[PDB]
Design an enzyme around this catalytic site. Structure first.
Site, PDB file in Angstrom:
ATOM      1  N   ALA A 183       1.407  -3.701   4.018  1.00 23.77           N
ATOM      2  CA  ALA A 183       1.489  -5.172   4.435  1.00 23.77           C
ATOM      3  C   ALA A 183       1.001  -5.830   3.297  1.00 23.77           C
ATOM      4  O   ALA A 183       0.391  -5.492   2.450  1.00 23.77           O
ATOM      5  CB  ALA A 183       0.535  -5.401   5.635  1.00 23.77           C
ATOM      6  N   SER A 233       0.793  -1.249   0.082  1.00 22.60           N
ATOM      7  CA  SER A 233       0.028  -0.006   0.056  1.00 22.60           C
ATOM      8  C   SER A 233       0.844   1.322   0.144  1.00 22.60           C
ATOM      9  O   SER A 233       0.292   2.260  -0.147  1.00 22.60           O
ATOM     10  CB  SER A 233      -0.866  -0.084   1.033  1.00 22.60           C
ATOM     11  OG  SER A 233      -1.654  -1.140   1.197  1.00 22.60           O
ATOM     12  N   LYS A 267       0.383   3.728  -3.036  1.00 22.01           N
ATOM     13  CA  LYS A 267      -0.842   4.797  -2.951  1.00 22.01           C
ATOM     14  C   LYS A 267      -0.459   6.180  -2.863  1.00 22.01           C
ATOM     15  O   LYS A 267      -1.309   7.166  -3.181  1.00 22.01           O
ATOM     16  CB  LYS A 267      -1.830   4.336  -1.880  1.00 22.01           C
ATOM     17  CG  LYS A 267      -2.423   2.956  -2.032  1.00 22.01           C
ATOM     18  CD  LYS A 267      -3.408   2.594  -1.040  1.00 22.01           C
ATOM     19  CE  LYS A 267      -3.748   0.931  -1.174  1.00 22.01           C
ATOM     20  NZ  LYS A 267      -4.664   0.766  -0.170  1.00 22.01           N
ATOM     21  N   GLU A 326      -5.114  -3.816  -6.664  1.00 19.86           N
ATOM     22  CA  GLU A 326      -5.573  -4.390  -5.437  1.00 19.86           C
ATOM     23  C   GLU A 326      -6.664  -5.525  -5.718  1.00 19.86           C
ATOM     24  O   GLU A 326      -7.633  -5.340  -6.548  1.00 19.86           O
ATOM     25  CB  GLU A 326      -6.291  -3.490  -4.305  1.00 19.86           C
ATOM     26  CG  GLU A 326      -5.132  -2.194  -4.052  1.00 19.86           C
ATOM     27  CD  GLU A 326      -4.214  -2.750  -3.281  1.00 19.86           C
ATOM     28  OE1 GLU A 326      -4.132  -3.920  -2.758  1.00 19.86           O
ATOM     29  OE2 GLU A 326      -3.245  -2.087  -2.771  1.00 19.86           O
ATOM     30  N   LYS A 377       3.260   6.588   5.079  1.00 20.49           N
ATOM     31  CA  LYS A 377       2.223   5.395   4.634  1.00 20.49           C
ATOM     32  C   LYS A 377       2.865   4.135   4.899  1.00 20.49           C
ATOM     33  O   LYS A 377       3.923   3.807   4.474  1.00 20.49           O
ATOM     34  CB  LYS A 377       2.048   5.532   3.232  1.00 20.49           C
ATOM     35  CG  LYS A 377       0.952   4.656   2.447  1.00 20.49           C
ATOM     36  CD  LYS A 377      -0.419   5.061   2.944  1.00 20.49           C
ATOM     37  CE  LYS A 377      -1.304   4.219   2.321  1.00 20.49           C
ATOM     38  NZ  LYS A 377      -1.465   2.872   3.385  1.00 20.49           N
ATOM     39  N   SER A 430      -6.045   3.496   3.941  1.00 22.54           N
ATOM     40  CA  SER A 430      -5.528   2.669   3.038  1.00 22.54           C
ATOM     41  C   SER A 430      -6.611   1.737   2.493  1.00 22.54           C
ATOM     42  O   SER A 430      -6.506   0.489   2.047  1.00 22.54           O
ATOM     43  CB  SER A 430      -4.409   1.743   3.920  1.00 22.54           C
ATOM     44  OG  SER A 430      -3.802   1.089   2.748  1.00 22.54           O
TER      45      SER A 430
HETATM   46  C1  LIG Z   1      -1.769  -2.157   2.324  1.00 19.85           C
HETATM   47  O1  LIG Z   1      -0.731  -2.464   2.166  1.00 19.85           O
HETATM   48  C2  LIG Z   1      -2.654  -3.022   1.604  1.00 19.85           C
HETATM   49  C3  LIG Z   1      -2.563  -4.334   1.479  1.00 19.85           C
HETATM   50  N1  LIG Z   1      -3.454  -5.212   1.373  1.00 19.85           N
HETATM   51  C4  LIG Z   1      -3.517  -6.717   2.254  1.00 19.85           C
HETATM   52  C5  LIG Z   1      -3.164  -6.272   3.570  1.00 19.85           C
HETATM   53  O2  LIG Z   1      -3.563  -5.275   4.095  1.00 19.85           O
HETATM   54  O3  LIG Z   1      -2.539  -7.121   4.455  1.00 19.85           O
HETATM   55  C6  LIG Z   1      -4.879  -7.234   1.952  1.00 19.85           C
HETATM   56  C7  LIG Z   1      -6.012  -6.467   2.690  1.00 19.85           C
HETATM   57  C8  LIG Z   1      -4.881  -8.671   2.820  1.00 19.85           C
HETATM   58  N2  LIG Z   1      -5.857  -9.414   2.459  1.00 19.85           N
HETATM   59  C9  LIG Z   1      -5.829 -10.738   1.398  1.00 19.85           C
HETATM   60  C10 LIG Z   1      -6.970 -11.116   1.469  1.00 19.85           C
HETATM   61  N3  LIG Z   1      -7.672 -10.711   2.779  1.00 19.85           N
HETATM   62  N4  LIG Z   1      -6.817  -9.780   3.277  1.00 19.85           N
HETATM   63  S1  LIG Z   1      -5.083  -7.440   0.187  1.00 19.85           S
HETATM   64  O4  LIG Z   1      -5.416  -6.179  -0.206  1.00 19.85           O
HETATM   65  O5  LIG Z   1      -4.105  -8.059  -0.286  1.00 19.85           O
END
Ligand SMILES: *C(=O)/C=C/N[C@@H](C(=O)O)[C@](C)(Cn1ccnn1)[SH](=O)=O
Length: 263
Positions: free
Chosen positions: A212, A45, A48, A141, A209, A105
């Site tokens: 993960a 993220s 972004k 995403e 920012k 996010s």
């Molecule tokens: C920010 O870094 C967004 C990343 N998106 C991940 C995350 O926050 O760990 C998600 C939300 C995790 N995820 C996948 C399936 N269920 N939760 S996703 O957007 O990869």
């Protein structure tokens, strides 16, 4: 400082994973400290901020407006959309979408903003155009978080991301009003509490920012400094760890404590 480098290496030991680190002087661009500065890591993220930089560039050129209202449907919503899931009937402005992407996010907000500029390949073109030939977005995403080992899709290097963040926040690349808007969204960041913010004393400025991903991917980009003003850029990335979210948070926080202590 050398003791911050000792803690970055200790973080590799505790996470059983690679950690990339750079500190830039915000004013001069000079590198003050680095570890693995030219190895690739997933952006997660953290992209972004670059996306809203591309949006603000278009507003500056008379090709977009903060006030333009966008309507979307149930089928646009992806995982973790805490703002966008509430505005199916009324829509959201471009301004509201950048706020939701950076400060909360919101993943759907990032997808809607990628649609406005023509997708990941146009974010990559924006980056080439301002001299970043390394940072690249390839996917939407949520797939851009997959973090397959040795896959260069949706990656940056600590040195590239730090230089790019500096040019967005202080260059002639964005107008004064657009620079101020980008750092204002980053200063209101609500979801990076257990990272550099937990080590940051009262009176210090931070605009950041967090990110993960899969396979223990974690990171943060930040403009921070004492006396209520930013004076440095810090970029921290890790990927590959099997450690809990709490343990990855704690290692980045401890890198933060060391950076502050030896400022
Ligand atoms: C920010 O870094 C967004 C990343 N998106 C991940 C995350 O926050 O760990 C998600 C939300 C995790 N995820 C996948 C399936 N269920 N939760 S996703 O957007 O990869």
């Amino acid at each position: 400082h050398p003791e911050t480098l000792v803690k970055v290496k200790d973080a590799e030991d505790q996470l059983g994973a690679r950690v990339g680190y750079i500190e830039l002087d915000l004013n001069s661009g000079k590198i003050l400290e680095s570890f693995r500065p030219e190895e690739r890591f997933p952006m997660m993220s953290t992209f972004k901020v670059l996306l809203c930089g591309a949006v603000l560039s278009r507003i500056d050129a008379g090709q977009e407006q903060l006030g333009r209202r966008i309507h979307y449907s149930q089928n646009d919503l992806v995982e973790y959309s805490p703002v966008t899931e509430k505005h199916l009937t009324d829509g959201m402005t471009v301004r509201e979408l950048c706020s939701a992407a950076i400060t909360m996010s919101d993943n759907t907000a990032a997808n809607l903003l990628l649609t406005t500029i023509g997708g990941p390949k146009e974010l990559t073109a924006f980056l080439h155009n301002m001299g970043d030939h390394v940072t690249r977005l390839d996917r939407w995403e949520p797939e851009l978080n997959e973090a397959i080992p040795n896959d260069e899709r949706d990656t940056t290097m600590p040195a590239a991301m730090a230089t790019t963040l500096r040019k967005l926040l202080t260059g002639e690349l964005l107008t004064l009003a657009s620079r101020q808007q980008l750092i204002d969204w980053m200063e209101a960041d609500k979801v990076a509490g257990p990272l550099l913010r937990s080590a940051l004393p009262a009176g210090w400025f931070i605009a950041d920012k967090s990110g993960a991903g899969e396979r223990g991917s974690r990171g943060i980009i930040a403009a921070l400094g004492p006396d209520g003003k930013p004076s440095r850029i810090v970029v921290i990335y890790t990927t590959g760890s099997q450690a809990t979210m709490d343990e990855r948070n704690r290692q980045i926080a401890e890198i933060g404590a060391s950076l502050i202590k030896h400022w």
